[PDB]
Design a protein around this ligand. Structure first.
Ligand SMILES: Nc1ncnc2c1ncn2[C@@H]1O[C@H](COP(=O)(O)OP(=O)(O)OP(=O)(O)O)[C@@H](O)[C@H]1O
Ligand SMILES: Nc1ncnc2c1ncn2[C@@H]1O[C@H](COP(=O)(O)OP(=O)(O)O)[C@@H](O)[C@H]1O
Ligand SMILES: [Mg+2]
Ligand SMILES: [Mg+2]
Lengths: 495, 42, 467, 72
């Protein structure tokens, strides 16, 4: 009560001399302003109703200002005040665990964001000298993604697939799995995840935040929600806000991971924003600019060399393809901007094979680089064996052919996984080892899942010393291989 | 000025705070509805 | 002179001068910036107003700034001191090793060579790639195009060509990466440093690099190509030496031109493209020519948007190339690599008087049999192969063997495939395809030919499979 | 097996009896504050109906002097 009265005092009621303009016509989400003589381009003007807008067009007689809210709160004749700073957002480790909207205004309750530094959403990507090749591994905790199509730190993978094929699930598992690194001793393996929700139902993001709080995963995650209802100029801006909150870490020596979900619903917001500016539509009514929109956003997921801090910013854009057409306009626009891709088939998903990665088409163009040596040993064989199995699965003779079929089916059953169940790297190594070396070719395929579960519960309970040996020495030595072979054989015996 | 005005407005309200001041039946009805919702979920 | 900004819409800045205007194509410096922002004039609106395209971010431009005319178009440092350096569109070095200390500068908007200077000599260029050598033999001194969708091989292939051709080359080289990944440019830089092609402590560098990568505004992407053409034109003329000029991706030139052509107030052409698509492409591709003073061998990677070869951009560029090489996603999904489409690749030196008669006959037999198999595919996809004559079954078997044999493992794709990269000499390619067509290998299985070099390796792999 | 279940269940019931109370407290106090502001604003709007306009204008003019001095 008196707390509220202290809330009264200490508020800045000082008045300042500020330049101003008068709105002429608001409609279609683009206000026209008159005046603002000394207004910079891409500046952030502020309307009288607390709204904000980005000074977009500097025409000789007026300023076209895109409103960052609902244009029903803007009259004609209102007053627009320039805040004298290119569109900024608050950055810092004060945002971690906070659900901020596209402009850093906490939509969380939980007080305001106590940030002390601001970045520009319209910054430029690092050049060619600062960057260095991708070296460190980004552990997704998903067997299929971590073995076959690995990811690095600084890479910008893509997750592409249809409605409800488990793209958000892969994103959330990647976010959750980082919990173990974000508790250890060295600040060199800590990953500070970010999650941009663009044009998504608000209830979905609420439940996602609840899930991330169940798994203790909000200590480092920032959720930047520009949900379905929010005006188009906010869904267009949210990715850039998130990318700035990640660039802060990248430029201060830390490691970040940003998940845009989806980028197929930012390009739709941008197409709205453009067609309402009368810009000439192109292919599918998208403006010709709809490439630069994503290229400039995804070119910031860099990996700065050691003379520039050494930080990094992984990116996991999530595209959504109607009827699984990988050759549409936006899917190809983004497939030519990213360093890899993870195709989530909708018929593998409907077969219960989840996560539905289509390993035939998925690829990672840093791939074997930035992969733990142990996983490399175990999973190169899996890659070759799966390749051979795929070559022949179009009909269902000899010993080798049936051997390929059986081993491939076993491996497929082995790569399935459950939600919110990431696995440490050593656990994946152990499972895929028991799968590829051939200690499962007799067990029925239908049982391969049960085995997996049981096997884990054994290895985690009893032989944690071996798993720690694998983790510390990121490689399967000969003695470690022999001990692991003994463990697998003994466990399989009792089955 | 207005900072002092807010200060004194709060003073003269709290002094007439023998409870919730000038609330009305909506006060009790809404509070009871919320409390019963809490009961239903607790 | 000295004008003042009067409008700023996206990357198009309208400026006003009170004294004489600058002629079109000049460069203007925005006085009062924390960096160098060059605006290149493009129109003369009237009222002593010009409309300019900014070659850098135009964020923070206040209506009423001061713009100072340079008097000449964008001029970049050319000469032998650009070898091993990196350059943006406006010619500044972006490799952090100090200024490019040259004697002589070049304007990026020169004119195309006149008709009385074109060379006509045609000669095959051997690349070590089976399909390129056999069906679309590249010409030494002529424009070459790699048409591809997104994720089909344009860059792995242009890197294989870089390796094969350039490392075995005597002349200079230029790589103008326009509108493409930045990490790819960094990897290329650090991969030529380790190959000795670029030298950071000497003057023995052979490659100049120019970069307008995809993070750059539309103004820069639309002009870095001209900077590359200029750096290569110099080595062609003022040295009289054979140049190689790789460009990736030349479709970003026209795409950026169209991004910054709605703002110039033009009526949009067919698919939203600028009305001046064909002429803008022509005035650029017509300076990339071998003439009587030098010889430029240009390899351009053309992107085919949404996998549409009838799109105006590739459809227009098809007329500026000697040899095309249409990489197709349908083949790449079969695992064949390079995905080159044998029945869309063409060349202007597929002449029996240029490549001889055995080469021409083998290439045409390969194309005939592949075309027959393509015609059969419509029936095969439904009535199966059990409904074909015996000659048709034999044709299909040969066609599948040939489709596989065209696939090759590249050196730069070891990290992907693990296999060892192969150069197949031209005679070995002709011999192998001649044998497959004759029928000397109807007993082997298809997969014996998948990802092998000369046919000796095919026979060896067929032996391995038989045990 | 019942041992651990009952041990957890006692914690469940105590924490639920705590949560009911804390949630009721939050709800009632926040609604109280909201009404606080509502009426305080409505009544200060009325209280602005005095005859102090001369003091306000004097303060505004003095602050204008301050701004003018600072802006040159
Ligand atoms: N690995 C998995 N195992 C089992 N079920 C899964 C898995 N991943 C996702 N699902 C299920 O798929 C359904 C939708 O998945 P999800 O929301 O992750 O897909 P999505 O592509 O994000 O959908 P949308 O993009 O439309 O939001 C959910 O019911 C979820 O439980
Ligand atoms: N010769 C090849 N051998 C094996 N794989 C290839 C080959 N060429 C391309 N690929 C695969 O296709 C992908 C296409 O990438 P790339 O060609 O570099 O980009 P672009 O889309 O510009 O062609 C590569 O990452 C690689 O995985
Ligand atoms: Mg989802
Ligand atoms: Mg490429």
């Amino acid at each position: 009560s008196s707390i509220l009265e202290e809330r009264i005092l200490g508020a800045d009621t000082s008045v300042d001399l500020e330049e101003t303009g008068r709105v002429l016509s608001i409609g279609d989400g683009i206000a026209r302003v008159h005046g603002l003589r000394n207004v910079q381009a891409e500046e952030m003007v502020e309307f009288s109703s607390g709204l904000k807008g980005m000074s977009l067009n500097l025409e000789p007689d007026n300023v076209g200002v895109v409103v960052f809210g609902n244009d029903k709160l803007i009259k004609e004749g209102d007053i627009v005040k320039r805040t004298g700073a290119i569109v900024d957002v608050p950055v810092g480790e004060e945002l971690l665990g906070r659900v901020v909207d596209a402009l850093g205004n906490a939509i969380d309750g939980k007080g305001p964001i106590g940030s002390k530094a601001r970045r520009r959403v319209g910054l430029k990507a690092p050049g060619i000298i600062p960057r260095i090749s991708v070296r460190e591994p980004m552990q997704t905790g998903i067997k299929a993604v971590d073995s076959l199509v690995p990811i690095g730190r600084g890479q910008r993978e893509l997750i592409i697939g249809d409605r409800q094929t488990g793209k958000t699930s892969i994103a959330i598992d990647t976010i959750i799995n980082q919990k173990r690194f974000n508790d250890g001793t060295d600040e060199k393996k800590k990953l500070y995840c970010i999650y941009v929700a663009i044009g998504q139902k608000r209830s979905t993001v609420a439940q996602l935040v609840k899930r991330l709080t169940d798994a203790d995963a909000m200590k480092y995650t920032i959720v930047v929600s520009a949900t379905a209802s929010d005006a188009a100029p906010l869904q267009y801006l949210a990715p850039y806000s998130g990318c700035s909150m990640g660039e802060y870490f990248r430029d201060n020596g830390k490691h970040a991971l940003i998940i845009y979900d989806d980028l197929s619903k930012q390009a739709v917001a941008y197409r709205q924003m453009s067609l309402l500016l009368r810009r000439p539509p192109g292919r599918e009514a998208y403006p010709g600019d709809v490439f630069y929109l994503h290229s400039r956003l995804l070119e910031r997921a860099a990996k700065m060399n050691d003379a520039f801090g050494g930080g990094s910013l992984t990116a996991l854009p999530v595209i959504e393809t109607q009827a699984g057409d990988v050759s549409a306009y936006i899917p190809t626009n983004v497939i030519s901007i990213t360093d890899g891709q993870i195709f989530l088939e909708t018929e593998l998903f409907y077969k219960g094979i989840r996560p539905a990665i289509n390993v035939g088409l998925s690829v990672s163009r840093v791939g074997s680089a930035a992969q733990t040596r142990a996983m490399k040993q175990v999973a190169g064989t899996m890659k070759l064996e799966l390749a051979q199995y795929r070559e022949v699965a179009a009909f269902a003779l000899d010993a080798a052919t049936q051997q390929l079929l059986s081993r491939g089916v076993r491996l497929t059953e082995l790569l399935k996984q459950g939600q919110y169940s990431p696995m440490a790297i050593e656990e994946q190594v152990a499972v895929i080892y028991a799968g590829v070396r051939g200690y499962l070719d007799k067990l029925e395929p239908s049982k391969i899942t049960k085995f997996e579960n049981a096997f884990l519960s054994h290895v985690i309970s009893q032989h944690q010393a071996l798993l720690g040996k694998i983790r510390t020495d990121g490689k399967i030595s000969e003695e470690s291989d022999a001990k692991l072979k003994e463990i697998v054989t003994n466990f399989l015996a009792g089955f | 000025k207005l900072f002092v005005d807010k200060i004194r407005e709060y003073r003269t309200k709290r002094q007439t705070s023998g409870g919730p001041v000038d609330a009305g039946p909506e006060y009790q009805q809404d509070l009871d509805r919320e409390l019963f919702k809490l009961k239903q979920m607790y | 002179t000295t004008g003042r900004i009067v409008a700023v819409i996206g990357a198009v800045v309208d400026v006003q001068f009170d004294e004489g205007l600058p002629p079109i194509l000049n460069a203007l410096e925005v006085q009062g910036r924390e960096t160098r922002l060059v605006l290149e004039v493009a129109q003369h609106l009237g009222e002593s107003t010009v409309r300019t395209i900014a070659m850098d971010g135009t964020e923070g431009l206040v209506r009423g700034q001061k713009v100072l005319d340079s008097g000449a178009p964008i001029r970049i440092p050319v000469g032998p001191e650009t070898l091993g350096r990196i350059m943006n569109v406006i010619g500044e070095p972006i490799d952090e090793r100090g200024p490019i200390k040259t004697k002589q500068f070049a304007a990026i908007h020169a004119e195309a060579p006149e008709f009385v200077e074109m060379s006509v000599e045609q000669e095959i260029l051997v690349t070590g790639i089976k399909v390129v050598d056999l069906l679309a033999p590249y010409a030494k001194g002529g424009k070459i195009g790699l048409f591809g969708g997104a994720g089909v091989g344009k860059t792995v292939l242009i890197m294989e060509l870089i390796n094969n051709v350039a490392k075995a080359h005597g002349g200079y080289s230029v790589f103008a990466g326009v509108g493409e990944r930045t990490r790819e440019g960094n990897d290329l830089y650090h991969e030529m440093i380790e190959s000795g092609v670029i030298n950071l402590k000497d003057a023995t560098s052979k490659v100049a690099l120019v970069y307008g990568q995809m993070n750059e505004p539309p103004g820069a992407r639309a002009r870095v190509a001209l900077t590359g053409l200029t750096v290569a034109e110099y080595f062609r003329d003022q040295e009289g030496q054979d140049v190689l000029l790789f460009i990736d991706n030349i479709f970003r030139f026209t795409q950026a031109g169209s991004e910054v052509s709605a703002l110039l107030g033009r009526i949009p052409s067919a698919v939203g493209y600028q009305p001046t698509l064909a002429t803008d492409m022509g005035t650029m591709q017509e300076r990339i020519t071998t003439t009587k003073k030098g010889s430029i061998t240009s390899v351009q990677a053309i992107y085919v948007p949404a996998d549409d070869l009838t799109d105006p951009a590739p459809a227009t560029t098809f007329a500026h190339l000697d040899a095309t090489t249409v990489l197709s996603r349908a083949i790449a999904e079969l695992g064949i690599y390079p995905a080159v489409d044998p029945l869309d690749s063409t060349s202007r030196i597929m002449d029996p008087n240029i490549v001889g008669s055995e080469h021409y006959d083998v290439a045409r037999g390969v194309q005939k049999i592949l075309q027959d198999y393509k015609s059969l595919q419509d029936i095969i996809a439904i009535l199966g192969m059990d409904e074909l004559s015996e000659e048709d079954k034999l044709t299909v078997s040969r066609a599948r063997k040939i489709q596989r044999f065209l696939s090759q493992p590249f050196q730069v794709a070891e990290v992907f495939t693990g296999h060892l990269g192969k150069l197949v000499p031209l005679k070995e390619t002709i011999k192998g395809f001649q044998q497959i067509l004759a029928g000397e290998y109807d007993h082997l299985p298809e997969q014996a030919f998948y990802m092998v070099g000369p046919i000796e390796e095919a026979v060896a792999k067929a032996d391995k499979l038989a045990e | 097996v019942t041992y651990r279940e009952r041990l957890h269940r006692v914690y469940r019931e105590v924490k639920n009896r705590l949560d009911y109370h804390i949630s009721v407290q939050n709800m009632m106090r926040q609604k109280e504050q909201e009404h606080m502001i509502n009426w305080v604003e409505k009544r200060v709007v009325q209280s602005i109906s005095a005859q102090q306009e001369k003091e306000t204008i004097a303060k505004c003019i003095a602050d204008l002097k301050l701004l003018s001095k600072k802006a040159q």
